[PDB]
A paper describes a structure:
Banna virus (BAV) is the prototype Seadornavirus, a class of reoviruses for which there has been little structural study. Here, we report atomic cryo-EM structures of three states of BAV virions—surrounded by 120 spikes (full virions), 60 spikes (partial virions), or no spikes (cores). In the full and partial BAV virions, genomic dsRNA segments and a number of RNA-dependent RNA polymerases (RdRps, VP1) are packaged in a double-layered icosahedral capsid consisting of three proteins (VP2, VP8, and VP10). The spikes protruding from the outer capsid shell are heterohexamers composed of a VP4 trimer capped by a VP9 trimer.
To experimentally evaluate the significance of the electrostatic interactions between the VP4 trimer and VP10, we treated BAV virions with alkaline buffer (pH > 10). Negatively stained images of treated particles showed smooth BAV cores, and compositional analysis by SDS-PAGE revealed that VP4 and VP9 were dissociated from the virions after alkaline treatment, suggesting that high pH treatment could indeed disrupt the VP4–VP10 interactions. Because the electrostatic attraction between VP10 and VP4 is weakened at high pH, BAV core particles can be conveniently obtained by alkaline treatment of BAV particles. Cryo-EM analysis of the BAV core was performed using a similar procedure to that for the full and partial BAV particles. The core particles are DLPs with a diameter of ~70 nm. The spikes have been completely removed, and the upper domains of VP8 trimers are fully exposed. Accompanying the dissociation of spikes, the fivefold channel for exporting mRNA transcripts has been widened, and residues near the fivefold axis moved outward. VP10A near the fivefold channel moves more than VP10B. Negative-staining TEM showed that there were separately distributed “fibers” surrounding the incubated core particles, also indicating that the alkaline-treated virus particles were transcriptionally active.
Numbering used by the authors:
A (entry chain B): 353 to 403
B (entry chain H), E (entry chain J): 2 to 302
C (entry chain Q): 1 to 236
D (entry chain K), G (entry chain F): 2 to 299
F (entry chain P): 1 to 249
The structure:
């Protein structure tokens, strides 16, 4: 895979602001998920369209 | 008649004359900066129980992501850094890395590349020459602390001449028993335990009586211009790793116990001022080699 | 990079017309060639890896100031992208383009009395590939036809059968042979998919791979950086 | 003193230095993969009473449809595979196939050109030198199993020095009758039938008593990094076919009975680690050559 | 008078008496099956340019998803397999694998530890003894093909007795020149180049004429019960790998050039029926070792 | 595994009541107890890893036929999960419970001449951890009370200061002391820390981690007993009750 | 024949076989991490004027809030760290700390106790034996820099055998005056000041001329696998503190000047490989002990 080229002006003088921090899901994950699991499972079942 | 000299000061081999331009210096400084990021990312990855911090740092360092079923050694950046370290040590070592690779690698970071921002103190004591009379035996042992043991048999008041060179800044002399020491054509002062000397003052004469061997312990301090990122602990550790891996196993070269003896021996040779500039760049490269090699450990006993 | 990217005889000859001799030579002392050395390849082996330094490695090496040293530097530039260190060539020859040195009598350089067998041995023709061999023979033919030594070029090809099979099909004086030539001489080029960022065992192989990997980035980001220096300056 | 050496270790000719880059290694891996599909498709064609599977396989390998009147050479891939094999053997080979052909053939399949992801054991016995005193006659026969026959006509017992090189990992040393063998500057042990030795730990001395000859059989194993798809059964068959077909008929070269003798002889040169990688790539090419030629005989 | 015997048949060391139960055989069979998937998945991963098939197969073998920096070696299954291989070879081996680990590993796949489903042919020539008269010299060389060179210096023709044992099924004899051979107390036939013998028939007598030496080449075929997954090519490679890695360096053990010589030597010993059963399990375990180590290379040169 | 998961004294003593002595015997040949061996640990080193075999391990080892060996095999079962190979023990002894062997006179075993210092050296005590040492002291106390050598138990405790501090406090004949004990004696259990599948160097450590990882699998298996979710399905005998009492006591 | 050995290499005492499992290794790594934050909290206390950063870090370390009434000791973590260090040094030291407490303390942080992800360079010089003839006197002094003084009083020159062990990677020899050193069965080289040796190659012969004494200075480098959080400067400081605090005071043990001498001495035992793993964990614990005791001195 390769990215598509921009306009010629943007290649010669173009600049872009980017953030390299990817983050982590551990703070949300790291908990006693015993009671919140049932509520999350109900939302999970509803995500996929039901016959 | 008899002459004695320090072991580490004898026959300093020439250093490499390659990879000393501004672009090559920027490459070494980039390697040190990115190797440091590798060490911190490994610590973060260990604490976070994830490979995300290490992958980002390795990808920046090696232009490739870490690969499964394939040892991670550092890619082309590691290959270029290892070969230039070999080239810095001796002229006999070849020049293998092309200029295109260095310019590509030097553009990864935004380092200054200055090699004269700061200073460092080196503790190797240079004893260039100790001249002794016919019935006196003199022995020089040590590099960080030189122990000179002198015995006089017969007659009396043998005169021993000390030549510490001209590069060292200050030299401190300590004796087992108080002794007399003064410069050339100067009166001898009362015997005392310790002396503070400037090596540029001139040759130093020490009076040695009969019997009762007198041992003089000498410590020296020398200042050399080094970058701000210079860290002597990392450089010395990198020096031992390079010696163990065999990067310095070149023909017609001299081997030293530490980077301190290496830089001092090259400084005391002829045209030693221009040798030191190459040695400092070798020190920064060995600093990067140490941090990179600890982050990625290939060798397993 | 630009010389190794040319894939046709027309493009290679056009590039040599626009390129001064300064680009062929280098100002870095390098090391003496023909030396058995041990290099570090930690990708594969823990032990050091033996190899022999050559003039076609892609890294500047010391060369003599005679006619042979200048010719060998030019051929190395064509086949490896980097030349040798010839001390104090002079401004008179540096301004001249590579083709005039090869195919003109106004340079003041006597390129006669040249032995192609000796030059080929020094350039390690046994180690270069088909494209590098083809480029070397192109330089030989241009030198031979300018000095009227077409017989010595044919004698050299007869002694070396493998080089005779892949000899270029052009005649230096005829333009029709240049335009209709279908040789492929591109050492580097933009590849379909990509190539892994991994090292190679040989000095020549690793240096050649470094040129291929950096060609893509060089292709995109060279026009502006070169223009900034080119502006407000007179060409040599 | 007399010196005896293995026949297959004498004068290893230089190997070629071309077609060892990443692009060329991918071409060899692609050739092996497509050759294997060619053999499989022919078997499927025989089973199902239809030529459809073979037509698809031959079309991909040769870039052309099979024809009844024309002959099945294998196309441009067959010519390139034969040419690279010639270049691998000796440095005097022409090495004519261009790069644009190599890249176009490596793009047919997507396989990495990694040649260091596995290993193989080669059972060839390197006997660099067997130093013998006067009156003692030493003969070395064989490569896979080296039988050393020694007898002394002198009055006293003699010392025979064995050197197995520094490349082989283990050497198992079996004698016809119990014999004593020890390293340099070590006490001699009691006579015993078999010995296990690491060739790295210096030369070895065997005490030869006066009387009947002592015949000692040697077996060695060496590990060399090879690709995953390496198959010693196929590689050895390809080595014989290429030798039979004249692919190795180049002036100023040596010839070997089998591929393992070739790879160990080149390993034991002045700088043998250079040639091992080139020899390994040659082995995979011979494996592809064997599979292709068996499917498409000429 | 003189007695000559094959080198590989002398003093077979005792084999292990542990991990020979039904549950242990299942653990060995499971390891071989999962190691085979490991090799196949790695080949498929290379073709499809994705590490998913290998990561999925390694997860079943090692019960863990590998990290990038940590070297992949096989985990507990590799550790158990390597130590169990050592225990089979000799009695002196520590045999330090718990039964809980064996039971858990055997439950990964639904396979049966049947070591008597099929057979294999082992071509090692057993020459228990060759008895010769005083003025004749006999030398025995080789194991896969034994070459017996006998020279008669005596005045008249001599009789040499061959004892091939009782385990082998078929022994084929060839000579440099046609020779005479017959069973004990039976007429001597005409000189022929080739004889086909049943080793159970009895000691065989060969007539050695005075003159040029006679060399008899011997080839044997023995059939031993092995599992249906047995592959002689893979077993031999695993035997060499185990020997090189140093798994067989135990005190007071005999070292053999091949698994062919190992299994035949233990067969030609007291209680050899029971020894062969243990050696067969070691063979399949060695087959698992070769496949697993080839897919997961650790040693570098 | 089941024995190593017992946390309280009540749970451990109850388990020793149900478990017959045959589970302490191994029926597997094993190897010699004390021997310097070279083992393979390829995850860390290429060179073989030196180690010394010991009686306290998860593997069978050869044990002496006398009453000393039988006592040692019981202790090794409690602290390591695997016993020793003592050949040809009568069927009467094998069907008896472990607690009956240690705390009853009906069995024909004579233990009056047992020396606690010798046993502690054979079942290496300098190598055990704190929980393993506590379990051993429970076995020593039960033997002392059955034999009347309660003084010999005290002299042994006074000769070793650390053992006296951690010695479990209960009366082998009173159940009220057992209930009041707050000691924790669980070698294996659910780990608060992160437990990986990597191997360990020592034989004891690698064997212990095999039991630790096995218990986690056994925790999530269908054989595990969940009190908070299936308490009504349990038999009345095995249900957790406050008035549960050992036989006698 | 006079045999001289290094003082620190003799009689290495057995090390503890406890607290080497995965859970215990995580406890030591947690202690190092939490002790590091405790030191840093002092600097973060200076940037502001409050003690909240220190109180916050102490509560995490000690599971209890600091109080002005009593001396800050360290809570349960301090007692566990102190006792675990004692068990590491000698096998006679009790394993007082329960595993339940260690598991609880290991859950404070999410570090992984991998102790084989880096390496360190150790500069102790192992001289196993120096063998000298009758007339010569040999004295070995020092560990970091071995000064071997040899004097020859006989009529002729003497040969002195040096054995540097089989563990050290490189050894550098520097003499007061040029001298000749060659390996056994190898020709003597010319006199040089400096020799670089690989100890695995074999014992070395040194020629001692008759006359003035010759002194050889030796420096060695050994690579030992250590955790990435290893800090040699911090480990050495903790070793001196533990020695002064009496953590190592136990019968039938050997005392060493530095952790460099301790780890090398254990490595050079009969089965020294298994000792090094425990010694490394002790160093990491000593590193945490130094950081914690400096923040909280008692």
């Amino acid at each position: 895979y390769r990215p598509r080229r921009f306009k010629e002006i943007e290649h010669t003088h173009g600049y872009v602001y980017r953030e390299l921090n990817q983050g982590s899901l551990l703070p949300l994950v790291d908990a006693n998920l015993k009671e919140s699991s049932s509520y999350y499972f109900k939302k999970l079942m509803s995500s996929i369209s039901n016959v | 008649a008899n002459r004695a000299t320090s072991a580490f000061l004898d026959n300093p081999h020439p250093v490499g004359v390659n990879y000393v331009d501004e672009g090559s210096r920027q490459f070494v400084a980039v390697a040190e900066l990115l190797a440091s990021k590798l060490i911190d990312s490994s610590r973060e990855s260990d604490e976070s129980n994830s490979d995300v911090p290490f992958v980002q740092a390795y990808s920046k360092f090696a232009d490739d992501n870490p690969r499964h079923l394939r040892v991670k050694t550092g890619g082309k950046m590691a290959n270029a850094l290892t070969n230039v370290i070999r080239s810095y040590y001796s002229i006999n070592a070849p020049a293998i890395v092309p200029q295109v690779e260095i310019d590509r690698l030097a553009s990864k970071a935004t380092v200054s590349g200055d090699m004269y921002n700061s200073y460092a103190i080196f503790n190797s004591v240079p004893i260039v020459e100790v001249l002794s009379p016919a019935r006196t035996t003199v022995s020089i042992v040590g590099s960080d602390r030189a122990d000179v043991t002198m015995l006089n048999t017969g007659a009396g008041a043998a005169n021993i001449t000390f030549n510490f060179g001209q590069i060292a800044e200050t030299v401190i002399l300590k004796g087992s028993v108080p002794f007399q020491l003064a410069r050339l054509n100067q009166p001898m002062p009362a015997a005392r335990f310790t002396y503070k000397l400037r090596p540029l003052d001139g040759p130093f004469i020490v009076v040695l009586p009969v019997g009762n061997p007198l041992v003089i312990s000498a410590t020296a301090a020398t200042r050399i211009q080094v970058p701000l990122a210079f860290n002597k602990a990392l450089v010395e550790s990198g020096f031992q790793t390079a010696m163990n891996d065999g990067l310095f196993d070149i023909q017609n070269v001299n081997y030293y116990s530490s980077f301190d003896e290496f830089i001092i021996s090259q400084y005391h040779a002829q045209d030693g001022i221009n040798r030191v500039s190459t040695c400092v760049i070798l020190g920064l490269a060995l600093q990067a080699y140490d941090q990179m090699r600890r982050a990625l450990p290939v060798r397993r006993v | 990079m630009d010389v190794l990217s040319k894939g046709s005889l027309k493009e290679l000859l056009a590039h040599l017309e626009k390129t001064p001799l300064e680009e062929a030579i280098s100002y870095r002392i390098g090391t003496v060639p023909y030396q058995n050395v041990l290099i570090s390849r930690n990708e594969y082996y823990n032990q050091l890896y033996p190899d022999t330094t050559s003039l076609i490695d892609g890294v500047s090496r010391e060369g003599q100031r005679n006619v042979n040293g200048l010719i060998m530097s030019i051929i190395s530039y064509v086949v490896s992208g980097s030349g040798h260190y010839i001390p104090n060539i002079g401004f008179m020859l540096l301004r001249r383009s590579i083709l005039d040195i090869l195919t003109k009598h106004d340079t003041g350089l006597v390129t006669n009395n040249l032995n192609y067998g000796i030059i080929a041995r020094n350039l390690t023709v046994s180690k270069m590939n088909c494209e590098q061999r083809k480029r070397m023979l192109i330089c030989f033919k241009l030198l031979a036809y300018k000095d009227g030594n077409q017989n010595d070029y044919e004698i050299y090809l007869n002694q070396n059968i493998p080089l005779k099979q892949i000899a270029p099909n052009f005649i230096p004086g005829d333009m029709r042979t240049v335009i209709h030539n279908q040789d492929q001489l591109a050492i580097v080029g933009i590849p379909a998919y990509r190539l892994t960022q991994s090292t190679e065992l040989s000095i020549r192989d690793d240096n050649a791979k470094s040129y291929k990997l950096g060609y893509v980035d060089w292709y995109n980001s060279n026009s502006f950086l070169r223009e900034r220096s080119e502006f407000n300056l007179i060409r040599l």
